[PDB]
C-alpha cells in the first residue's frame, strides 16, 4: 500500500541540493579551512571546499529521494 | 495454516528498497560525514555513504520479505 | 514546501563577502604571517594573505547562499 | 550493478587536465622556484615547472577517470 | 549452504579495478605529490603515483572477490 | 552425544577462506593503506595487505572448523 | 539584517594602520634583523624592515575593515 | 558540470603577467644580485634578472589560466 | 472551538525575541567561550556567540507563536 | 504581559561591561598567556588579551540586555 | 543593584601590579631564558624578560579592575 | 587586604642575587662554553658568561621582589 | 515574628571565616595541588590555593550571616 | 559558641610543616624529577623540588590553622 | 598529638641517601648517558651523572625526614 | 628497618663493572666510531672508546651500590 | 588459629619462580621489544628483557609466599 | 601441586627458537631495514638483522620455558 | 605439538629469494641511487645496489624459514 512515512518530503526542500542547510555546511567549511591554514600554513584544507560540494552533489544525486 | 502476522507487508512498502525511510538514512549519513570531515579533516566518513547503500541493498536483497 | 531552516540568512550578512568576520580573518592572517617572517626570514607566509582572500571570494562565490 | 560513487565526476571538471586547480598548482610552482632562485642562485627549481606539468599530464592521462 | 553476505557485490562494482573510488585515490595522490614537491623540491613523491596503481592492481588482482 | 551448536556451519560458508566477508576485509585494507600512504608517504601500510591474507590463511588453516 | 559581529571594530583601533601592535611588530623586526646581522654578517635581514611595512600597508589597505 | 574552484581568477589579476607581485619579484632580484656582486665581484648574478623574467613569461605563457 | 491552552502567551513575552531569558543565554555563552579560549587557545568558541543569536532569530522567526 | 524573568538584572550589574567577573577574566587571561609564553617562547598568547576584551565588548554590545 | 562578585578584590592585592605572583612570573622567566640560552646559544630568550613586564604593565593597565 | 601569596619569599633567598641556584647557572654556562669552544674553535661562547651575569643582575634588579 | 531557624548560628562559628573547616579546605587544597604538580609538572594547581581563599573571603563576606 | 569541628587538630600534627606526609611529598618529588631528567635530559624538573617546599611553606604559613 | 603517618619511616631506609633505589637511579643514568653518547657523540649526557647525585644529596639533605 | 628494595642486587652482577651489558656498550661504541670515521674521516669518534670506559669506571666507582 | 586462605599455595606452583606463567611473560616481552625495535630502530626495548626477569626474581624473592 | 597453566607449551612450539613466528620477525626486519636504507642511505639498519637474532637467541636461551 | 602459525609459508613464496617484492626493492633502489647521483654527483649511491642484494641474500640465507 502506501508507506506511511511517505508524503511530506519537504524533507527534500529542507535538505535539498538547494537548501539553506546545504549552503550552511560549505560556508563554515570555507571558514575553518581558511582558519586552519593560518595556524598550519600547510596546503591541506582547501579540498572538500570543492570536494564536499561534489561529494554533496553525488550523494544528493545518489539518493535524491 | 496461515501465519497471522502475514498479509499486510505495506511494511515492505514502508521499509522497501524504495521507501522514504531508506532514503532518509543515507541522507543524514551524507550530512554527518560531510559534517564530521569539517571537524576531522580525515578521510574517513565517506564510505557507508556508498557502503551502507549496498549494505542496505544486500540485506534488503537478503531478506526482501 | 518551505524548508524550515530557510528565511533568516542574516547568516549571509553575518558571514557575507562583506562581513566583520571575513575581515577579521585576513587581518590576523596578515599579522601572523608578518609575525612568522620575523622568526623564519623565509618567503612563505605572504600568500593566503592574497590567496585566502580570493579563496574566500571563490567559495563565497561558489556558495553565496 | 551501479557503483554508487559513480555519476557526478564534475570531479573531473573539478580536477581535470583543464581545471582551475591544475592551473593553480604550476602557477605557485613558477613563483616559488623563481623565488627560491633569488635566494639560492642555483639552477635547480626550474624543472617540475615543466616536469610537473607533464607529470600532471601523464597521471591525468594515466587515470583520467 | 549459502553464505549470507554473498550476493550483492556491487561492492565489486563499487570498489572494482574500474570504479570511481579507485580513480579518486590516485587523483588526489597525483595532486598532493605535485603539491609536496613544490614545498620539498625533493624527488620523492612520484612513486605510488605509479606504484599504488600497480599496488592497487596486485591487491585487486590478489583479492578480486 | 551431539553438541547442539553443531550442524549448521554455513558459518563456515559465511566466514570461510572463500567467503564474501574475507574478501571484504583485505579490500578495505588495500584501500586504507593506499589512503594512508598519501598522507604519510612512509613505507608502512603495505604488509597485512599480504600479511593479513596469509595471517587469515593460517588461522583459517588453524581452526578451519 | 545586522551581522551580529558588527559594531565594535575598536578591533580596527586595536589593529589599525595606526595601532600599538602594528608599531610593535616592525620594532622587534628591526631588532632581530640587526641582531641576526651581527651573527650572519650577510646582507639579508633588512627587507621586511621596509617590506613588511608596505606589506602591512597593502593588506591593511586590502582589508581595512 | 561546473568545476567549483572556477570563476574568480582575479587570481590571474593577482598573479598575472601584469601584476604587482610579479613586478615585486624581479625588483628584489635586481637588488640582491647587485648586492651580491659587491660582495662577490664575480659576474654571476645578472641573469634571472633577465632570465626569470622570460622564465616568468614562459610559465605564465605556459599556464596563463 | 477555542484551544484551551490559548490565550496567555505572556509565554511569548516570557521567551520572546526580546526577553530576559534570551539575553541571559548569549550572555553566559559569551562568557564560557571567552572562558574556554583561555584554556584552549584555539579559535573555536566564538560562533554561536553570533550564530546562536541568528539561530535564535530564525527559530523565533520560525515559530514566533 | 510581564515576562516573569524580567526585573532584577542586577544580572547586568553582575556581568556588566563594568563588573568584577569581566575584569576577572582578562586578568587570568593575561596571566596564563604570560605563563604559556615562558613555556612556549612562541608569539601566540597575546591576542584575546586584547581580542577577548573587544570580543567581550562586542557581545556585551551585542546583547547588553 | 550590587554585583555580588563585587567587594573583595584583594584579588587585586593578590594579582596586582605589585603582587608576589607577578614578581614570581618574571623571575622564573629570567631563569628559563638564561637557562635556554646555555642550551641554544641563540639570542632569543631575552625579551618578555622586558616585554612580558610591559606586557604585564599594559594588561594590568588595561584591566586594573 | 593581604595578598595571600605574600609572606614567605624565602623564594627570594631561594632565587636571590646571592643564591645557590644563580651560582649554579653561570657555572655550567662557563663549562659548556669552554666545552663548545673545543669543538667549535670559534670565538662565540664567552659572552653570557659575563652577559647572563649582568643579564641576571638587571632582571634581578628589575624584579627583585 | 521570629524566624525559627534563627538563633543558634554557632553555624557561623562552625563555618566562620575563622573556623576549623575553612582551614581544613585550603590545607588539602595545598596538598593535592602540590601532589598534582609532581604528576603533571604543569603550572596549574597553584591558584585557588590563593584564589579559593579570597574566594572563600568574598562569599564569606558576601553572606557572613 | 564552640565550632564542633574544633579541638583535635592533631590534623596539624598530621599535616604540619613538620609532618611525615609533608616530608613524603618532596621525597617522591625529588625522585620523579631525577627520574624524569634521565628520560628528558632537559633542565625542567628541579624546581618545585625547591619551589613546592617554599610553596608548602607559604600555604602552611598562609593557613597554619 | 601524634601524627598518625608518623612512626615507620623505614621509608627513610627505603629511600635514604643510602638505599638501593637511590643507587639504582644513577646506575641507569650512567647507562643511558653512555648509551646516548654513542648515538649523539655530543658532550651532553655526563652531568646529572654527577649532578643528580649532588642534586639527590641536597634534596635528601633538604628533606631528610 | 630493612629497605624492601634491598637484597637482590644481582642487579650489580647484572650491571657490574664486570657484566655482559657493560662490555656490550663499548663494543658497539667501538663499532660506530670506526663506522663513523669511514664516513667522516675526521678524528672525532675515538674517545669515549677510552673515555666512556673510564667514565663507566668512575660512575661505577661512584655508585657501586 | 589457622588462616583459612592458607593451605593450597599451588598458587606458588602456579605463579612460582619456576612456572609456566612466568616464562610466558618474558617470552612475549622478548617478542614485542624485538617487534618494537623494527618500528623504532631505537635502542630501548631490550631491558626488562633482562630487567623484568631480575625484577621478577626480586619480588618473587621479596614475597615468595 | 600442579600449576594449572602447565602442560600445553605447544606455546614453545608456537614461539620456539624454531617457529614460524620467529622466522617471520627477522624477515620483515630484513625488509624494512633494506627499505629504510633506500630512503636514508645511512648505515644504520643492518644490525638487529643479526642482533635481534642473537637477541632472540639469548632470551630464548634465557627463558626457553 | 603443531605450532599453529605453521603451514602456509606461501609467505616464503611471497617474500622468497625469488619473489616479486624482493625484485621490487632493488629496482627502486637502482632508481633512487641513479636519481640521487644526478643531484649529488658524488660516488655514494651505488652500493646496496649490489650490497643490499647480498645483504638480502645473507638474511634470506640466515632465516630462509
Curated annotation (Swiss-Prot), chains A, B, C, D, E, F, G, H, I, J, K, L, M, N, O, P, Q, R, S:
Membrane topology type: Multi-pass membrane protein
Parts of the chain on the Cytoplasmic side: 41-44
This protein's GO CC annotations: extracellular region; plasma membrane
Cell membrane in keyword set: yes
Principal cellular location given in the protein's record: membrane
Annotated keywords: Acetylation, Cell inner membrane, Cell membrane, Conjugation, Membrane, Plasmid, Secreted, Transmembrane, Transmembrane helix
Membrane-traversing stretches: 20-40, 45-65
Compartments, record wording: Cell inner membrane; Secreted
Disulfide bonds: none
Family indicated by similarity: Belongs to the TraA family.
Complexes and interactors: Monomer. Interacts with itself to form filaments; also interacts with TraQ.
Function: Propilin is the precursor of the pilus subunit, pilin, that forms conjugative pili, the filamentous surface appendages required for cell-to-cell contact during the earlier stages of bacterial conjugation, and that retract after contact is established. Mature pilin is assembled with the help of TraQ and TraX.
Name used for this protein in its record: Pilin
Organism, as annotated: Escherichia coli
Upper taxonomic lineage: Bacteria, Pseudomonadati, Pseudomonadota, Gammaproteobacteria, Enterobacterales
Residues of the full protein shown: 57 to 121 of 121
Amino acid at each position: 500500500q502506501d508507506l506511511m512515512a511517505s508524503g511530506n518530503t519537504t524533507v527534500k526542500a529542507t535538505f535539498g541540493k538547494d537548501s539553506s542547510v546545504v549552503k550552511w555546511v560549505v560556508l563554515a567549511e570555507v571558514l575553518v579551512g581558511a582558519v586552519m591554514y593560518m595556524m598550519t600554513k600547510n596546503v591541506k584544507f582547501l579540498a572538500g571546499f570543492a570536494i564536499i560540494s561534489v561529494f554533496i552533489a553525488v550523494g544528493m544525486a545518489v539518493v535524491g529521494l
